[PDB]
Design a protein around this ligand. Structure first.
Ligand SMILES: [Mg+2]
Ligand SMILES: [Mg+2]
Ligand SMILES: [Mg+2]
Ligand SMILES: [Mg+2]
Ligand SMILES: [Mg+2]
Ligand SMILES: [Mg+2]
Ligand SMILES: [Mg+2]
Ligand SMILES: [Mg+2]
Ligand SMILES: [Mg+2]
Ligand SMILES: [Mg+2]
Ligand SMILES: [Mg+2]
Ligand SMILES: [Mg+2]
Ligand SMILES: [Mg+2]
Ligand SMILES: [Mg+2]
Ligand SMILES: [Mg+2]
Ligand SMILES: [Mg+2]
Ligand SMILES: [Mg+2]
Ligand SMILES: [Mg+2]
Ligand SMILES: [Mg+2]
Ligand SMILES: [Mg+2]
Ligand SMILES: [Mg+2]
Ligand SMILES: [Mg+2]
Ligand SMILES: [Mg+2]
Ligand SMILES: [Mg+2]
Ligand SMILES: [Mg+2]
Ligand SMILES: [Mg+2]
Ligand SMILES: [Mg+2]
Ligand SMILES: [Mg+2]
Ligand SMILES: [Mg+2]
Ligand SMILES: [Mg+2]
Ligand SMILES: [Mg+2]
Ligand SMILES: [Mg+2]
Ligand SMILES: [Mg+2]
Lengths: 216, 187, 233
RNA sequence: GUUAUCCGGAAUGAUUGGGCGUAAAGCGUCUGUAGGUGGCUUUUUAAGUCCGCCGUCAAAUCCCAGGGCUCAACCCUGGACAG
RNA sequence: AGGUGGUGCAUGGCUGUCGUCAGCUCGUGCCGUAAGGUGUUGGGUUAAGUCCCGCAACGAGCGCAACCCUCGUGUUUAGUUGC
């Protein structure tokens, strides 16, 4: 059967939004467009400037709040050792490009980076991690179990990991998954962090879904 | 009387959580596990085929201590492990002679597995078939003749071997039983 | 060391008789004695040697510092057991015995963890801040956990000496100790096989009096052994 | 390397070494002739049985101990368990 | 480059369906040579493997229910553009 993205299931309950602004219905389309353009840019930049210097860059999410004057981008990020340490700190080097994209009329932009303390208690990061290890042609069993380890030693109450595709380049696709601890998906009161990631291998695509349960 | 909360939290901290404490201790028990057989047995459900792995595994020290155990799981790894744990609680000792061999000739019976062991001269090594040979070898028996007659099931042959070498009487003990000095029976 | 037994007191408490001759295990024919009115009479000269070796091993075991369980689940023996254990300061099972108490320890002990949380809850008085469903539920948990964990609730770790009443009804106790490498010191009536116990004392089933006699001699041995282990460590 | 032949593995014709309630397999049931096996005690005999000694079972081969072709295969000397 | 060109039997995502049916399983133990079983069955009761008794099983997890929205009764507060 189909589940609901357990994100979207608690909305205005145990989960906030990401884009925090308001607009009159007409402008709403344009504004939406604008968010998309910068989320795209800021994803690209960091991808190319960190994977050139060979590291694992968690970009956990991007919150955008628009105020009439200044629009503010808050990057939740797991290891900004790759964005700060470089000489043109990501702050300025991005501030310039993003401010090129959206517009500079009546809008000036501010970037702020936040350190998400426990990187393995965030699904998105973890999934990118498994993505790396699988792109490296490690067997998926090992990958899964390492992830479970890292996470549970990183402070987590429950986790469910699911990997789907042609696993191990084998010709017939399948679905492998592991539940660990306790994952209520139906309890709305449960703080649930989900994420969806896609992987490009020699043998084609691989989906990863990760569920993580942080308590009630 | 000390308070209930701190003493029960003492038995709580001394019995450690299985979600915060990882597992590798087993080479501290001075043992080695050998996977004899891996099979995929199946339960069948309205959905389809529900696949499990059976593992037949034997443990020894190669020093004169051996046991068998059988386990079942979804993945090779977990089955293997349960197999190990089961064997470790089933384990026995094989009577050895100064040259590392059997006191005497013996047969054994389990199911349709029949097993024949007889001692060998030093320097002949262990000649046998799969179950019997891995069990023997893992016990540390250096020189033995063995043949399994009757069936071939890996598992029953393992068990059988164990029943064989369990009923092995060592001379000191037959001298103790009969109530006769060693030198008299030697003759 | 000596113990308190004579043919006269064993006669008094009524140990020497056992179940009808249609009910008997011939496995016990080696040490039975006579048969009267369709009721069996069991040897007391065997009973005394076994009761002495029982109290002696009980004494050595207490003095070295080993831990004791007692078991019987009958209606009368249950009332005698709470008091036997309290007088000897040991662990007991009187109420319904749960399969797996010994062999499956891990899960048993988690069940103890949550029982301890229930015991802190109840005395804290934080069960007054609940819905009525929550309080009656917490009280189900309590009722059971008292029946099952009451006599063992002190003991942490695996018990290495187990004492038992009437092995006929107690099959699982015997099985679990057979399995785990634990000695059983057990009461035999004319119907039960002398396989299942390490030291098996010819005894009486139906009599509260026989139970009282042999259990009191035994708990007296546990108590003097308790003074000797309070001395040696 | 492939094919043919034979023994093995094959306890798959089984003395050592299997089976016959349901897997191949107990005559439909008895009576009984040949044949096989058959209780206890003492004595006899000595056909089996056992132990010693002798004759023989050719030489070559196999087995043990030396020797000769530079080694080995091969040849030569001596001797013997089996049965 | 571009392909709404081939392969949904090479795939991810996404969705239907049996069915909003009450099921599906796992850990430790115990029974069985083993596949497996027990737990989950029995007596009651529920919209429900809901819940309670009993039972070599004791617990847990995903389901159910609940926490979420809207409509039903009241109270406090706020009064324009609505009264
Ligand atoms: Mg599904
Ligand atoms: Mg047979
Ligand atoms: Mg064979
Ligand atoms: Mg043949
Ligand atoms: Mg034959
Ligand atoms: Mg046959
Ligand atoms: Mg037929
Ligand atoms: Mg037939
Ligand atoms: Mg017939
Ligand atoms: Mg006919
Ligand atoms: Mg006839
Ligand atoms: Mg005749
Ligand atoms: Mg005759
Ligand atoms: Mg005769
Ligand atoms: Mg000749
Ligand atoms: Mg030679
Ligand atoms: Mg030479
Ligand atoms: Mg010659
Ligand atoms: Mg001859
Ligand atoms: Mg192209
Ligand atoms: Mg399809
Ligand atoms: Mg329904
Ligand atoms: Mg199980
Ligand atoms: Mg078993
Ligand atoms: Mg039940
Ligand atoms: Mg079911
Ligand atoms: Mg079942
Ligand atoms: Mg059943
Ligand atoms: Mg009913
Ligand atoms: Mg049952
Ligand atoms: Mg339920
Ligand atoms: Mg619901
Ligand atoms: Mg309203």
């Amino acid at each position: 059967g189909q589940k609901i993205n357990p994100l979207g299931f608690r909305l205005g309950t145990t989960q906030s939004h990401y884009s925090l602004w308001f607009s009159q219905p007409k402008n709403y389309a344009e504004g939406l467009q604008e968010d998309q353009k910068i989320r795209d840019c800021i994803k690209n930049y960091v991808q190319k400037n960190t994977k050139t210097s060979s590291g694992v860059e968690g970009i956990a999410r991007i919150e955008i709040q628009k105020r009439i004057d200044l629009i503010q981008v808050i990057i939740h990020m797991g290891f900004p050792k790759l964005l700060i340490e470089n000489r043109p700190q990501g702050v300025e080097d991005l501030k310039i490009n993003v401010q090129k994209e959206l517009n500079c009329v009546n809008r000036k932009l501010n970037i702020a980076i936040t350190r998400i303390a426990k990187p393995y208690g965030d699904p998105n990061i973890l999934a990118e991690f498994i993505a790396g290890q699988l792109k490296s042609r490690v067997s998926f069993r090992k990958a899964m179990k390492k992830a479970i380890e890292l996470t549970e030693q990183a402070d987590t109450k429950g986790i469910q990991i699911q990997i789907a595709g042609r696993i191990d380049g084998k010709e017939i696709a399948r679905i492998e998954w592991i539940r660990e601890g306790r994952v209520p998906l139906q309890t709305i009161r449960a703080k649930i962090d989900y994420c969806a990631y896609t992987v490009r291998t020699i043998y084609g695509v691989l989906g990863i879904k990760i569920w993580i349960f942080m308590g009630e | 009387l000390g308070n209930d909360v701190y003493a029960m939290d003492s038995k709580i901290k001394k019995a450690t959580g299985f979600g915060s404490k990882s597992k590798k201790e087993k080479i501290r028990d001075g043992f080695e596990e050998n996977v004899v057989q891996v099979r995929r047995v199946t339960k069948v459900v309205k959905g389809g085929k529900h696949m499990r792995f059976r593992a037949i595994v034997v443990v020894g020290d190669k020093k004169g201590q051996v046991g068998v155990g059988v386990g079942k799981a979804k993945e090779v790894v977990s089955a293997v492990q349960k197999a190990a744990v089961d064997a470790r609680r089933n384990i026995i000792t094989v009577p050895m002679t100064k040259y590392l061999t059997f006191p005497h000739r013996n047969e054994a019976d389990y199911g349709a597995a029949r097993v024949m062991l007889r001692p060998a001269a030093p320097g002949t090594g262990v000649i046998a078939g799969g179950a019997v040979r891995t069990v023997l070898e893992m016990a540390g028996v250096e020189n033995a003749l063995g043949k399994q007659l009757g069936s071939n099931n890996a598992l029953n042959n393992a068990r059988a071997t164990i029943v064989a070498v369990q009923t092995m009487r060592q001379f000191s003990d037959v001298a103790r039983d009969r109530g006769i000095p060693m030198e008299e029976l030697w003759k | 060391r000596y113990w308190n037994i004579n043919l006269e007191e064993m006669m008094e408490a009524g140990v020497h008789f056992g179940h009808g001759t249609r009910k008997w295990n011939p496995r016990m024919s080696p040490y039975i004695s006579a048969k009267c009115k369709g009721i069996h009479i069991i040897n007391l000269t065997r009973t005394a040697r076994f009761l002495s070796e029982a109290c002696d091993l009980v004494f050595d075991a207490s003095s070295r510092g080993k831990q004791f369980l007692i078991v019987g689940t009958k209606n009368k023996a249950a009332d005698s057991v709470a008091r036997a254990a309290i007088r000897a300061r040991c662990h007991y099972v009187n109420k319904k015995w749960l399969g797996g108490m010994l062999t499956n320890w891990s899960t048993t002990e988690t069940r103890l963890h949550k029982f301890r949380d229930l015991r802190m809850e109840q005395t804290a008085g934080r069960l007054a801040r609940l819905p009525k469903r929550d309080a009656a539920v917490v009280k189900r948990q309590l009722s059971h956990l008292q029946t099952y964990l009451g006599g063992i609730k002190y003991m942490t770790g695996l018990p290495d000496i187990v004492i038992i009443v009437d092995q006929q009804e107690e099959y699982t106790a015997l099985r679990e100790c057979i399995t785990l490498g634990i000695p059983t010191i057990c009461l035999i009536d004319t119907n039960c096989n002398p396989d299942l116990a390490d030291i098996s004392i010819p005894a009486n089933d139906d009599a509260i009096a026989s139970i009282r006699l042999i259990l009191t001699k035994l708990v007296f041995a546990i108590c003097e052994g308790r003074s000797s282990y309070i001395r040696n460590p």
